[PDB]
Each structure stands twice: as C-alpha cells, then as structure tokens.
Design a protein around this ligand. Sequence first.
Ligand SMILES: [Ca+2]
Ligand SMILES: [Ca+2]
Lengths: 428, 428, 428, 428
Amino acid sequence: TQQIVPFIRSLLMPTTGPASIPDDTLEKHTLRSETSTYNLTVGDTGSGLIVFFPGFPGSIVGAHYTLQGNGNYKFDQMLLTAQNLPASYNYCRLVSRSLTVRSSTLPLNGTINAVTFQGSLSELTDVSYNGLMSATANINDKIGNVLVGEGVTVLSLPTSYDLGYVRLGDPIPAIGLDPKMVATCDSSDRPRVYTITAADDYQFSSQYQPGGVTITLFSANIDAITSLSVGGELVFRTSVHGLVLGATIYLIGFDGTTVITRAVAANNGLTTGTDNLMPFNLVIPTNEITQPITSIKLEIVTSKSGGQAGDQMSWSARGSLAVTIHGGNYPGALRPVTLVAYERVATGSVVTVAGVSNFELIPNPELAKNLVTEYGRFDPGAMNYTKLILSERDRLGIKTVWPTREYTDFREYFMEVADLNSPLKIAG
Amino acid sequence: TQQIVPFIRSLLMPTTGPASIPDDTLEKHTLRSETSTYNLTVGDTGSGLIVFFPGFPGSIVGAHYTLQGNGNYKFDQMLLTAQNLPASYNYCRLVSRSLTVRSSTLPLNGTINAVTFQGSLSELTDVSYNGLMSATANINDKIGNVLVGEGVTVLSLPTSYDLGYVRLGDPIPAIGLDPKMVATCDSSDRPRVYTITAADDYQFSSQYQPGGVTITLFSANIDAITSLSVGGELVFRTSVHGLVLGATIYLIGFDGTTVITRAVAANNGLTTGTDNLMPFNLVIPTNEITQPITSIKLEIVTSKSGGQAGDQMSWSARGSLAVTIHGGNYPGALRPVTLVAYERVATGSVVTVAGVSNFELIPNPELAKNLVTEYGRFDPGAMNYTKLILSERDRLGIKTVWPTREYTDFREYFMEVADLNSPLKIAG
Amino acid sequence: TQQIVPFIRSLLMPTTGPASIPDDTLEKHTLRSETSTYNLTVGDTGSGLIVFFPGFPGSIVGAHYTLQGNGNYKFDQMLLTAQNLPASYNYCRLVSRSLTVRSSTLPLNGTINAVTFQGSLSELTDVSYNGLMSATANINDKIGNVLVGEGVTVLSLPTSYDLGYVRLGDPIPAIGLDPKMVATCDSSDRPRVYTITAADDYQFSSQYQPGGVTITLFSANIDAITSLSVGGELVFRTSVHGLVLGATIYLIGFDGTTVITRAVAANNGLTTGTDNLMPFNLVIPTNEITQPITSIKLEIVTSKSGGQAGDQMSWSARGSLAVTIHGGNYPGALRPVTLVAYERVATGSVVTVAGVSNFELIPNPELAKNLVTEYGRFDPGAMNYTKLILSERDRLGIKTVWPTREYTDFREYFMEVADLNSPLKIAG
Amino acid sequence: TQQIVPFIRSLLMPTTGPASIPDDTLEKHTLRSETSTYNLTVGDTGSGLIVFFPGFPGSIVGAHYTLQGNGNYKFDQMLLTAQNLPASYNYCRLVSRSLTVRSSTLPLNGTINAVTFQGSLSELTDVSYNGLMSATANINDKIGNVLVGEGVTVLSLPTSYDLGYVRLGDPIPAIGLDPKMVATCDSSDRPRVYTITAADDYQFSSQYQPGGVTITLFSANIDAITSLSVGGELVFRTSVHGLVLGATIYLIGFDGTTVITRAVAANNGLTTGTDNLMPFNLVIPTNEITQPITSIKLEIVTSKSGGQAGDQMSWSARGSLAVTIHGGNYPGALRPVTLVAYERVATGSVVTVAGVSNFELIPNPELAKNLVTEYGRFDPGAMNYTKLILSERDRLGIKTVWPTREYTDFREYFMEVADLNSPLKIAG
Ligand SMILES: [Ca+2]
Ligand SMILES: [Ca+2]
C-alpha cells in the first residue's frame, strides 16, 4: 500500500467505485457503477433464500426465493442492477461487486447462513438453510448464523482475470411484422454444452389409452439465466402400425415450476420398419427465462389412431441431445454462486438488499457518440499486488461472505491510507 | 508476534481457520474447518443448559438441555459439526475451536453463566445456573451473568499436546443379512475404565411375589458419548430351591432418562450349594447412544417357580464389573466440559449457537484418492510461543469462557499485525 | 546452570519440591509433594527386600518383604505416599522422586545391595541379595555393599517424557445396596496384555477319585499392582459321560502367597461329542490386591457323578486367555523396579524409609472448587538441558541408586548456585 | 506502568483476578476469586436499594431491599459470594472487588443513583434514591441518574492496608446433643463497642394494667452483620410491693423488621428498698442474623401481682449496656457502604448483579492438607505505585461508583500494556 492501488480498493471495497482490471485485456472502455436496491418481503415461514451471481458480467445480480410451508421454494423476483445495461452498452466485464443483506423493518430478528459455491445453481446438492454450510470446505467462503439485524456482506472475489468482454443481451436494429418481435446479440463466447443421451435402444411398452400414455424420458439438471438452444435427434423404431408421437421439452425453475414449455413434435406418425426422426431445433431467447433454469425434461406422449382394450403400443428410441447455453462457461455467468439464506425472520418484515457493481463497458452505437472511451490507467504492480493479496487470502481473512460488522472493521483496518495529496499544492 | 504465528492465530481465533499443531506428532494430514450452527428454542421456564465438549476430537460439539417446571433437565438435541467427519475421514486431531451463544429473536432477554470444568459431565456436583460458578476456582474459566443479547464466547484451550490421532467412528466395509447392520472402527486409544464392585457377599432377603421382587443393586456415575463395553461377572449363592434371576443394565442420560437398556440375564435358575455365574458381555455401539450417558445401574429381579404366602427368597452375591469406554481417557473426548447455562430468557425465543472447529485429518480410503496430505508447516518457536502464552494465560486474561464483547476486544487487541507482505511485490 | 532450572533441581533433588515437566503435555495442573515415611522392623534372618516402583504415577511407592529361615520372602506391607492421592485428585503425572533407606535403631548393622531393573517385578530372574547385582549391566543402576547405617538413596530417573496424565484409582459417585460396594475410575491408558494359550488340544487322563483329581493347567509370571481383568475361553471335549469340571484362578504374590482366588467355573457338566465352553469373565478390583501380583495360575478339578475303582476320566482342552492389566504399560506403573536388599542387620532393628514424591495433579471435582490450576511455568531450554544431562548421565555419574553419602556430596557439587536474587531489591 | 503491577491490575480491575497486597502483613496464603451472581426481581414501585459492603473480608457482599408503596424498604435477600468461604478457609483478607448492576429483562427502563458512604449502614441519615447523593462530598464517590440498561460499576477502594487476617465464621469441631448446635470461630479482632446509658435514675410511673404496661426504654442505631453480644446491667429501685418486670431486647433490621428478639428478664419480682439487678448476658450468633441489624431497642413490661383500679406502679432505673459487635471495627467489616438505588424500573424486570471478589486466604485444616500456601510475590514499588495512584485518585478520576460505560473506557485507557513477553522465547 502506497496511496493505495485503485484496483485493490475497488476489488475489496466495491462501494468505493470502479477501477480498470490490470490484466492484458487492453480495450478502450469506460468505467461505471450500478447500484442494486431491493426491499424483499418475508413470507409465512419467516425463511427464504437469496441466490447471488457475484461474477455475473451484466445486470443480473441474483434471485429471491421464499421458503414455503411444504418445504418448497417459491420464486419471488430477479434482483437486478438499477438500470438495464444492455439498453446502453454492448460489451461488459465485471470489475468488482459487493452486496449487503439485512433486515430493516418489524411489522433482534432471525439469522443468516451464507456460502459461496464454486458451481452453478443446479449443482448444489443441498440448499437448505443448514445444508448450505457444507457447500465448500473453504472457511472464508461460508458464514453461519449471523444476526439478520446486523446483516451479511457478499464480496465478489475473482474467478479468473484476462476474461474477454462479454456481449450483453443488447437489442439489435430490427423491423418485423410482429409487435412482440425481439432481436438481440447475446453473450456467446465460452458456451456451456450439456450432452444428454436420452435413449440407447430404450424399449417402451404400454397398453392403449384414449388421450395417450405420457412418459418422462429423462430429466437432467442444467443451468441457464440467459438464452440457450437444444439440438440433436431422437430416432424411433416400431412394429406397431398407426402410432402417433407427441413430445414436449420443459425447462424447470429452481422452485420446481415450469419456466418454459416447448412442443418439440406434436402429432407425428411412426412408420413400421424405418427410422422415424425427431429433430430438436429449439432456441430459447433470454426474455422467456423469467427465473433461473435448474433442469430440463422431455415428455413423450404415445397414442394410436384406432385403439381398443388391450393393444400394447411399443417403440424403440435412440439418440442424444445437446443443450448449449450461450456464454454459459464464461466465469461468472453461471459459475460461482453465493447463497444467502435467512430463517426465523418475522413474517412481513423487510429484508433489505443494497449493492454496488462495477464494470468495464463499451457503449452501444448511440451512446458511443457521446461517451469517450479509453485504455485503462496504467499502474504496474497492481496485478502483482492483487495476486499477492489473493495468494494470502486465507491468512488475511478475505471472505466472499462476511458478517457486515466484520467487513466494516476490515475496511477501516485495510484502507489506512487515503492521504489527500501532499505538496502538489506547494510544489512550484 | 512477527507477521504472527499461524497456530496461535488459530488457537486464539478459531473462526480464522486451521493450522497444524506444532508438536512432535508428525503425520501426513490435511487441515479443515467445520462450522456448527444451531437455532435452539427456549422452553417454558426460560432456562436451559448447553453442554459443550470443547476438546472433542470429532463431530460432537455438545448437547442442549432445557430446564423444566419440576427442576429436571430434558434433552433437546446433540450439537454437531456441519457434516459428519467419520463419513469422510478416519483419523482426527483437534486444533482449535470457538463457539458463540446469544439470543437472536424475541417471541433484552435474560442472562448467561458459564464454566469450563476439568472433568467429564457426570462428575459435576452442581449443574444449576448458579451452582456452575464454583465448578472451578480458575477465574478465567468462569463467567457470570452475561446478557444473553450480547452473548458468550467459548474458547477451547488445550488439555495436552502431542496427542495421538483419534480414530473417528468411521464405517468399515461390511456386508450382512441385516439392513440395520453397522460396522465401525472406534476411538479406542486411551480407554477409560470404571471398576464397580457391585457386591461382596451381599445378602438379599425378601418375601415371595408374583411377578418377582426387583432391586437396584447399584447405580454409578460414568461418562460416555461413544461406544463402550461392560465386562465382569456376578456370582450368586443360595439355600433356596427354584429361584430364577433376571438382570438388566440401564445406561441413564444426563436428564435422568433411560438411554440404553440391556437384559444381561433373563430367566436364570439358581442351583443350591454352587456358584451361579452371571457374566457381563455387553458392547454398546455409538449409534445407540442418543445423548450423553451419565450413570449406569443394574437391576435384578428375583422370582420363584412355585410360590406362596411367606416364602422368603434369599441369595448371596459377589463380583465386580468393568465399564470400558473406548477412547474415553483421550484428553478432550470426555474430559473438559464447558457448560453454558441461560435463564430468564423469554419462552419461544431463539438461542443461537455458531462455532468453528479446526482439525488435522486423515482421509478415508475413498477420499484419500483425491485428497493430498502433507506434514505440517514448519515454524520453529511456534510451540515455545504457545507455551509462553499459556504460561501467562491468567495475566493475559485468556479465558475459556468470555463475554463476547470482551473476546471481540481481545481479538483486535491481539492480532495487531496482519501486514499484507512488504516487498515480495518489489524484490527482484 | 543459571540461577538453575527448577525442573532439573526437582529431578535431581526431589526433596527440594516439585516443578512442572517441561514437555508438550500442556494441561492445567497443580504441583504437589507427598512424603513417604516408614519404620520397618527387621526379621529373624536379619535380611529383607524393599521393592520400589520409582516411576509409579500415584500413591504406591513400594513394598517390603522380610526374608525367612526357609529362604522365602514374606510380605510385610505396602509402602505408600503419606496420603491417598486418589481421594483428592483424579489425574496425575510423576515429576520426580527420591527415597532414603538406612537403619535408625539398634536392638554398625549390616549391608545393602540395590538395583534398578528395567522390567516389572516378576521379570527379575534372581532376587537374592547377591543376585540383584546383575539385574542390569548399567554401573549407575546398581550399588553394592553399602553400610546400612550410612544408607542408600534411590533416585527416580525418567522412563519417557510426554506421558499422559494417569487416572488415579479415584472413587466415583455411586450408591448401592451393599455397604462394601466400591466404584472407581482406574488407570487405564496404555494397558498391558498377556496372552496365555493354556491348551492346544491338551489331553487329560486320570483314574477316578472321590473328591476329584486336581491339576494345575498352567502357571505364568505376570505383574499387577492395580486392577486387572481376565478374558478368553477354554473349550473341553470328551468321550466320557458325566464328568463335572471345577476351575479356579489364583493370583499369586511375590512371596508365593495367594493374593486372590476366583472360581471360574464350579460344578460344570461336560457333554459328549460337543464343545464345552468355559468362559473367563474376571474383573479384579484394585482394593483386592493386597500385595503385588507376581504370577497367575489356573487349577482344574475333574470329578464324575457315578464313580468306581478304575474309571479313567479324560478330556481334551483348547483355548487362550488374555490378562489385561489396566494402565500396566504406562511407563512407571509396573516397569522400572528398584530393589533395595539388606542383610546381616540385627534382628529387631529399624530400617527407616524416608522419601519425597513430586506430582503434577488435577483435583477431583470437590477439590477443584478451591484448587486453582495452571499451565506449567515456561522456561525454554529446560527440556534441552534435561536431555543434555541425561545424555551425559554416565560421565556425570547420575545414579538411580546411591550410597547416601555420595548422593549428598553430589547435591552440594551440583547446586552450587541458589543466589538470592541480585538487584531486584535495588532496581527502581 | 512496566508490563504492569499485578496488584494495581487487581485493584483497579478485579474481574482480572487476585494478587497479593504488597503491605507488611507477610503470611503464607493462597489467592482466590469468588464471583457473585444475582438476578433480582423489581417490585411494585419499580424502585429499590442494593446495599454493598465493598470491603467485607469474607462472603457477604451486600443486601437487596425493595421499596414499597408505603415508602418503607422490605428485605429481599443477602447477596453473597458464590460459595461460602468459611466452609473452606479460616482466615481471610480482601484484595479487591468489583460489582456490576444493570437491568436484563422486560415483561429504556429506569435510572440509578449510587454512593460510597464512609460509615456503616445505620449511620446514613438519608437513604432515599435522591438523598443518597449527599452522603459524601467526594465527587468520585457518587454517581447520579445512570441509565439502568447501561448500569453501574462498584469498585472497592482501600480503607487501610496492613490489615490483619480476619477469622471467617468457620465451623469448629464440636459434638452436642442438639441437632441445631452450631460452633464457630468468629471475626473478632478490632471489635466495635457501643455504650448505651439507658437510664440515670429514670423515674417510671403509670397506673395498673391487667397484662401490664410496656415501655420502650431506649432505641439506638447500631450495625451488625455477624455475631455480637450485649453486656451490662440495669438496676431498679421501688417503693411499691409486688411489682414484676419483663424485659426484651429487639434487634431491628434496615427494613424496620424484627430480626432477633431476646427476653432478657421475664417475670422478675422487685423488692422494696433494695437494688434489683437486671444483668445482660446476650450472645447473638451469626446464623441468627438474617439481615443487617440497624438498631437495638429494649422494652420493659411492668405488672403487679394483686392489682386494682388506681394502683400507680413506679420504679427507678439506672445503668448502662455495652453492645460489642465482634470484628465490627475491622475496616471493611461494617464501615464503608456502597448504596446502589434504582427507580422507575418496570415492575417484574430483572436487575442483574455480577461481581468478582479477590482474597488472600488461609485454608481450614482439612483443605490445608492439599492447598499449598506461600508468601506473596515480591515486587518492590508496588505499594509506592498504589500510594501514588490513590494520592492522585481525584485527578485520575478513580471512582468507587461508575457508569459502567465510563469504567469500561477507563479499563482500556489504563491497561495499555499487557505485552506477551518479548524475547524470553528467543533468549538462549
Ligand atoms: Ca495475461
Ligand atoms: Ca513431545
């Protein structure tokens, strides 16, 4: 520390403002801060979960779920940046981010558990208040039973530098006959791909039914916050004449709710002694994803034209699907997740979220006319200092989740120099 | 203090993370932290007791008892580590541990008394809120009438170094016809042995009874949290024909409740003019011990085949028993106990427990495939510094039980160097 | 030597008082001295033997035997600490110990031979006055023909540091119907185990006898001062109908006397063509051991229901037993033995024993209320200095058995600094 | 201050533990701390008084009185040390003491006034909440209108050093026919003596009454917490035949309640023309004094054998009494009193008292067998430093009664060195 190092200051105290990342990604950019402010209402059980995406390169900060009588979560709302970055910028990179979670009202109240998990949302094996505590072995990535009144601070720590600029989901110039037409340029670099072999000569056998017989061929945990696509093909064989197949893909939210439902093939006759192809050509736009996607499943309906008492409908199925979630493997886009769980909070009280997110940004064409961009400030040793700090992360006690009181202490313990500027004022 | 000394840091501030014990026990190990988080509910009397085992080499942290109208305690639950260490590790050693106890919700709220007692649970003569205060003469091992809102901090101070690695109660590969079959390898090194001479020619005499005459031959305070065994033999002599003996061993919990009941001999004819042997071959597995064992008693039922009005049944008994509690004398396993008693807390309010336990661990065979182990970091003078600190324990005011506010102050008073790392960043 | 080193002072001059052992066994403890004072009477032969247990962690110091006309020893009494430590303390560790043995009255007076033997009492091959001298090859562990008037000094030298605290045989809270009921918590850590395969298809054959035929199946040298147990099983096979077996275990004292006798199976019918089990479930409490146990033997009585002239009773026997003596392998508990033999002392004269034993102690629950405990005084280099001294033991002539006159000289030769305390008195 | 001075540390921060008083009273002693913990219930008026005896050499810490509707106090309970010192020790000396008084529960809340008065309880002219404030002129011995939630700290400041050891009221070995027999050895050194000349030829005159005529001859304020005796004699003269005198001594508590009542002479005929003696031979044992004694009064009943309408009974009385309260003048035994008054506290709320008392102690014969005693640690300049500190008491603002918040600040302002122990750890 001398004066200090703008980037370290920004990284460890994001509410302080942005600084350019001192890596090798030399783009002309501009630096911005976006606040997040939410007043969430506590449900009947007095318990709930905030899912944060600490590294998300853009306006999505997290999602809030209340816990319900029956032990299920129920989606409340997305937690966003104050304004929608893709409306003004085309490219983006996360510099630093911190968020605060505490109670502010009573209609001395409940506790919080928090973890930073090194995987995407659907990968967590246990998301209960208590179960959170073992999502990492890292002591500085979990905090237990912090009083809600005092609150918790979530600090975003890096998962890789020299990251590319991410395209935001920015609207692209387009005209179309449909009012509800939407055209964007999506986060794409570093896609995540899931491959699901749904069937390898899977035999299906069942008696006839008016209305048909529905099965769930498979269900698989995947993650999506933004646009994705499904490709691939199932091949069906049969000895039985006049079978008609229906198939639907469901994308399921964290709360078990159907987020998106897409008929992949409806009313589709099967021919005897031949391959019957069922292609998958699904594109799911960002705006359709009303809450984080947690799993995908495929249902198949089998029915017969004629039909009787005992008819026995049978088919064989083979094939694999590929689920590409665009930009999904970009560190921060899905990957690190910070969960903040609260319980025993009085029903009707307010859980207050306040955060600052800092970005390197490239303006969209209209803003670029009035927004000057520059290469980052050069200070050598900024990156080495960051590397040193992170290297000593555990001995310094630099947490991703803090009791706010401890984070406040840390701020003043660190940051003991901010020294005006000695004789520039008297120099010459 | 220079930078500092990882071990001292861990010992005095366990929430900070683990460090290797700088003794002579050089094993390849790995270092881990496990949190403990509980939200306990206050009962009708507004009063209760938390029993901590500050030195326990494993996942058992303590037990919670509520105090009842009639002045008895009633077991609530075991307080454990976040995850069950024996499921993942085979050997273990406690590095450091701290726990916090404070109220978090209102249904401001009562007082705490706490002590660290240099003996096992059943050895305490007085466990009432007030009586606690005289369990030690050591001023830094007791704290009185701390406000519950502010809370108490329990700090685990060593009871011996150069301790062996303890085998956790880890499951061992086994197949068996019984679904409920359980096979473990238990904490064994340093067993504790109790010897009870239950009778030395004890004469029994009583009139006949349909259903028999039951006596409690003896009752004795012992301690067990994990597996134990009972061995030995009673020998019975008699002049009366056709006497049948029943005998049962009861292991009683801290709350006076029967934890385990084992028939040692049921329906057992006594022959005239001969020794009649009653062997003890009891093995009590860990999983059967649902709460800490506090005493053992033996009941004997005496009945006669025929029977009338006045029949006078008599026998003479001789023999001693041995109760071996496996690994019981391992310092920390039973020995030091920290009691945290609360009273005058409003009924229905939450007493919140949060702790961190630090361990040296050896992975089980499956984890050992992916868990690198190492000999501890060498720093000379770490142990001498520890010895110095502990030697000056009282003048430094290093308590095992703290008002949390005072412990917090101590943390910042100590730990005045954590200094980044000066020119490594500028060296060469 | 600077001032000096409390521990070295205590180790080499125990009459000086206790000091904490400077090892890694960091327990809160208290330091105490216990004297031993005995005036033993010399028997008819003018000859006898004192067996010392120099390292015994507790109140047992040794035992006195007189030598008799027929060349046998006869037990006189146990030599103990002034007060019974287990009545006041639960845990204990030996710091240092010295004892003096000299004549004090005339009814000038005979000679002493002494050795420190690196094994337990029963392991000595030769315990005669003269034979002692070859129990070790170590010149500083034997002393020959010291005049009784001048006397001998026994100095306890370490057999391992970093020893655990030993549980004393302390009474445990217990109620029972029998007045003579005794419940203790025994020295257990580091048990010693003997395994005796008493028979491997041993054939027995003998003619009938009214009253039976008794054999001694085996006899084996073992050591016990405190509680022990016998486990295991013999299995008997036979072709002869109506055989009844009796079996008794005898624990024999150093003087050939029966200390303890326990019927293991009395009146026990053997069935033809089957295994007949004879289990061993013996627990022998400390208080029953009136003098050191030196061997164990098992007698078996064989009798027949019917019986005639020539009947030939036969059985086959198989099995092994295990004798566990609790805490038996704890260095000091049984292991080093110092023998002080005297002869040619006038009958009726007094052999005077005076000693000091120094301990680290943990008080029992009742005393713990008024007994402050602390971690040991820290002085670095205390242990290294001890290691150096012991490393040079032979060149320094540090004996375990001394002519008292030579030990006295050594005391004043060593210990040439005890220097008041220069200007603290004038400092500031 | 260098490191510091154990005694000053103990004196100014008693919760820190005991230290030997650095005066000339060189006794082999032991050092102990005793906590005091009470949860007092607030009465109907929301107002009450705690009387502390800050210098009391023993287990009596103070007494709690609630204030009542009618403006009278009513005794609640004695405030004691955690355990009864006289059960374990025979002699005692107070080193240092501090106590904390604050509210803890609610069914913010009230105020506290406190003073240290340089006299015994009964000597206070005004004990009302407001009146307290003028019991001393010393600004550092009074504190006004401290919030109850924050609380008050009572610090015991010396009233003389070189005090003798005080005998505690320890039980003495005794057998007697009465179960309720009690034999103690009492605080005696430095008795306090009151002399009351109850009459100097006091003429009594009154008409006859069936049942008699009762008068209160005198009433006088005295102080007693422990055993006292009354000696002396009244002499009665009369001209009237057949007068019978009854006389009773009452010892009255602070709350106006009779603590002890003793008939001094019942039914006692007076002879004409002679001295009629009425001796006083009262011994009042400690255990009879259920609350502090505040005054003594003597009532006399006068009756006549015969009796009529107008009979005029007359007597003359002369004499003085002496009330000796044993050890009463020992500084601390009665003398300094600290009053903590609260008012406007909500009815039913808890006023929490927590304290530490530090003592030099000599064990009773049974404990002396296991309790090592020593002369105090020598440090020169300890007493001079104490004398300096006290000499500058007012400029340093060292109070006997503090707002707890101010005392806490003082603790950290003082006590700025507690410095581990620099290179002992690296010396040689
Ligand atoms: Ca790079
Ligand atoms: Ca060692």
